[PDB]
Amino acid sequence: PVLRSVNSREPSQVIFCNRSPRVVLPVWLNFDGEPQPYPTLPPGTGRRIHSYRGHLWLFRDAGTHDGLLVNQTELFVPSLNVDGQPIFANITLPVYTLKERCLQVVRSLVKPENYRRLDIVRSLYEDLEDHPNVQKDLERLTQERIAHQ
Amino acid sequence: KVSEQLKCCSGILKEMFAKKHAAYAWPFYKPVDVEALGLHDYCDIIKHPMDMSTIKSKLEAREYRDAQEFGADVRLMFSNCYKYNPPDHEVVAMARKLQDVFEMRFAKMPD
Amino acid sequence: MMYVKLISSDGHEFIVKREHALTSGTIKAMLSNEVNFREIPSHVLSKVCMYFTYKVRYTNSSTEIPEFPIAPEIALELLMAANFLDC
Amino acid sequence: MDVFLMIRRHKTTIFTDAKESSTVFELKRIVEGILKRPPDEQRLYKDDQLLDDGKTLGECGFTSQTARPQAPATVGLAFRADDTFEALCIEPFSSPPELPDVMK
Ligand SMILES: Cc1ncsc1-c1ccc(CNC(=O)[C@@H]2C[C@@H](O)CN2C(=O)[C@@H](NC(=O)COCCOCCOCCNC(=O)C[C@@H]2N=C(c3ccc(Cl)cc3)c3c(sc(C)c3C)-n3c(C)nnc32)C(C)(C)C)cc1
User: Fold this and answer.
1) CA A50 – ligand 1 centroid, Å
2) Which uninterrupted H or E stretch holds C46?
3) In this structure, which CATH number among 1.20.920.10, 1.10.10.60, 3.40.50.2000, 3.30.930.10 belongs to the domain B1-111?
4) In this chain, where does the modification Phosphothreonine occur (chain D)?
5) Which of A106, B108, C75, D100 is the most exposed place for a label (fewest CB within 10 A)?
6) DSSP readout, D41-82?
7) Distance in Å, CA B37 to ligand 1 centroid
8) Count of A–D CB contacts within 8 Å?
9) Ligand 1 pocket: which of B33, B91, B94, B98 to mutate (most atoms within 8 A of CB)
10) CATH topology of domain D1-104
């Protein structure tokens, strides 16, 4: 596919730093564009990371799959270092809509088989069932990159 | 005799650091970062770590009594790599290429 | 700043900046001074206004952003309000 | 830094921000602008404590940590009719319904 890591084998020292209140799951897109999960980061923690030039990363909530930002944007690609200075990756909450935020909270309190037993408007059932999803975003990100070209 | 060999040992490490050999030398420039690489078992297996920057400090601090001690540390750096990793790993190939440079210059040092 | 009055079903008057209320698509359409919601109650509508303050404060902020809290017992109604208000 | 407030009387609730360094009198100017009542006809409260025009919000106990955008702090308001100030009174909001069985 289009969105995928380059197999450069050139080193890049990185710092992952979780400045959100969620437990973060880093996701690495491999050379065939397949997402690979990495170990999780608790809130407020950081750590040194060895990655490579041209490698794509994104970041999600480890329990719910809610999307998060990295350096104010959705994807992260490391450069080569300059004078052995680390590259910093700052992970944060986005400003969700009130609707999406209410969806998150209701999802956290209701089992999926009970969604359609809630006394609410029918269209919100579909909204509730359409969970945050890596694949779904990859298509949106891919096709915004095509429009861009 | 001993001091002149120790300048040669220095000249060799300087070449090992040079751009000419950067494509395979780069993993050995600094100590192994077990956090970044995510290697939970590295200290369990490698009881005595070594790298080029550590060796450079020891030269400049005059800690090597002679050229053989300098050699054993360079050979330790390589032995650690071959010990921890599987035979056909990219880092083992890179290690072999750099060791060939070391061995050639170390053998052609006047004694 | 211009203000607007948002009035709940139980007769509570909430006065907020026009700019903050324009966060909602449904309100934006209505206005372009006073607006009545005959089906949304004060314990919900008050929470909505807080969301406006939060959104305006933390959009384009380079400070790290805190969670918007929602208590379990208001979540269902706030979801319906949000969807109805498009915000 | 900034503090975020709900100024409240009867069934009226004003949302506004201000600073820890700003004063009680300055807060009354905001009210005057919105509700057409000069400072001398206003009384402001933190819980049951009457607040003095000359003190800052920080000095009255309002801090940025307890007065956030998503959880603003409350300030009580009372007007004067006919040369005597009314008793402070804030009508409560409605109550949420019981939690449905599937959300328990
Ligand atoms: C703990 C954590 N929390 C949240 S994330 C995280 C975490 C982050 C990073 C890592 C480790 N990094 C990676 O897995 C990176 C991240 C991403 O960029 C992809 N990736 C890879 O390593 C990929 N690798 C590559 O693209 C290059 O592929 C060569 C495959 O070998 C990689 C390492 O082998 C697995 C474990 N072994 C080692 O790390 C041995 C180590 N290797 C190397 C080494 C590795 C690769 C190469 Cl080409 C050269 C040297 C090494 C050194 S020192 C040094 C600076 C290095 C880089 N070294 C020495 C000396 N002796 N051994 C080593 C992948 C998925 C194919 C394994 C682990 C956990």
Assistant:
1) 6
2) helix C42-58
3) 1.20.920.10
4) 84
5) B108
6) GEEEEETTEE--TTSBHHHHT--TTTSBTTBPEEEEEEEEET
7) 5
8) 9
9) B91
10) Ubiquitin-like (UB roll) (3.10.20)
Sheet holding A56-61, edge to edge: A35-37, A24-29, A56-61
**Residue pair C37/D32 in contact by the 8 Å Cβ criterion:** no
Task: Say yes or no for a CB contact (<8 Å) between A101 and C62.
Answer: no
Residue numbers in A near D100 (CB within 8 A): 118-119
> In chain D, how many H helices and how many E strands?
2, 6
Give the relative orientation of helices B90-107 and B2-16 as an angle to the nearest 10 degrees: 150
Strands C34-36 and D42-46 come out as unpaired
Q: Which residues of D touch A111 (CB under 8 A)?
A: 102
SS3 C39: coil
Q: List, in sequence order, the alpha helices (H) in chain B.
A: 2-16, 22-25, 34-37, 42-45, 52-60, 67-84, 90-107
Both structure tokens of A45: 């923690």
Distance set, CA B40 to CA A13, B12, B33, B44 (Å):
19, 33, 11, 8
**Cα four-point dihedral sign D76, D81, D85, D89:** negative
Nearest to C74 by CA among C51, C55, C58: C51
**CA A90 from chain center: how many Å?**
12
Residues A15 and A84 in one domain: yes
Q: Does A116 contact chain C (CB < 8 Å)?
A: no
> Are the Cβ atoms of C42 and D93 closer than 8 angstroms?
yes
D13 CB-near residues (< 8 Å, 6+ apart):
C12, C13, C14, C15, C46, D6, D7
**How far is D1 from chain C, CA to nearest CA, in Å?**
13
